[model samples]
Target: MQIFVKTLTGKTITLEVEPSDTIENVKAKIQDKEGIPPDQQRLIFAGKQLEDGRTLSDYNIQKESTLHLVLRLRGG
Candidate 1:
């Protein structure tokens, strides 16, 4: 299915992926487009944090669902 990923600056991108794909894999896809590392990306759906080990189906994500992408702070 296709999902909408919105960045902090209100930029939205369309991503084609499967429900079976893990959160980490999705982040990898985002990295290719945004040049941001997967470890520093946070995907949120319906105000809930998506886990790297979990699949989109686990969070009931469907087509057109918008996931908020927030970048982690630098210099931990």
Candidate 2:
């Protein structure tokens, strides 16, 4: 299954992964692709936070699903 991901930086990245992949796995992949860390990653879908350890199946993520990943910013 392929998923479309949009970052807070207005970047769009696509992932072609399996249904068995967890949301954490997707987060790792996104971090790799975006050069960001998991701890600094924040994903929001439909105004809800995408919690870790949750599977795509748990959220009913279908093929070609579009998800928004917003990275948290800190510091003044």
Candidate 3:
């Protein structure tokens, strides 16, 4: 399945992922594509925090859904 990720800056990224993909798995893909470290990435979907422990299917995430991304500073 394919979904769109929107960043805080209004930047949007398209990702193709599996329904069984966990948030952590998708985060790794984000890190690979956008160079944002998984540790530094905060994600939200449907007005709530996205958990790494959950699968996309658990959240009922479907095609063209948007996951909001917030990239935080890794270190002070």
Candidate 4:
């Protein structure tokens, strides 16, 4: 299945993932694409945290679904 992921920089990337792919896998993919570390990445879908280890099905995610990866920015 293909899923749309919106980066914190406002760029969108579409990735082809298997049905068994976990949410953390998506985060890792996002990090690979955006050059952000996995620890700093937080994905939110429907206003909830895309917890690690949870499969896409657990969150009721589907093909062509759009998820937001909000990169937490820290500075003074």
| TM-score, one value per model | 0.94, 0.86, 0.91, 0.85
What local lDDT score does residue 37 receive in model 1, on the 0 to 100 scale? 94
**Clash tally for model 4:** 0
All candidates: CA RMSD in angstroms? Answer: 1.2, 1.5, 1.2, 1.7
lDDT of 3 by residue, 7-49 (tens): 8777999999999989999999999998988888989988988
Candidate 4 stretches greater than 4 Å from native:
74-76
Instruction: Give lDDT: candidate 4, residue 57.
Output: 87
User: Where's the lowest-lDDT run of ten residues in candidate 1?
Assistant: 67-76
RMSD value for candidate 1: 1.2
Give the Cα error of residue 3 in candidate 3, in Å. Answer: 0.1
**Residue 34 in model 2: shift from native, Å?**
1.3
Pick by TM-score: 1 or 2, better one: 1
Q: Model-by-model lDDT, in order?
A: 0.92, 0.82, 0.91, 0.83
Model 1 spans with C-alpha error above 4 angstroms: none
* Candidate closer to the true structure by lDDT (higher is better), 1 or 4: 1
User: Model 3, which residues run further than 4 Å from truth?
Assistant: none
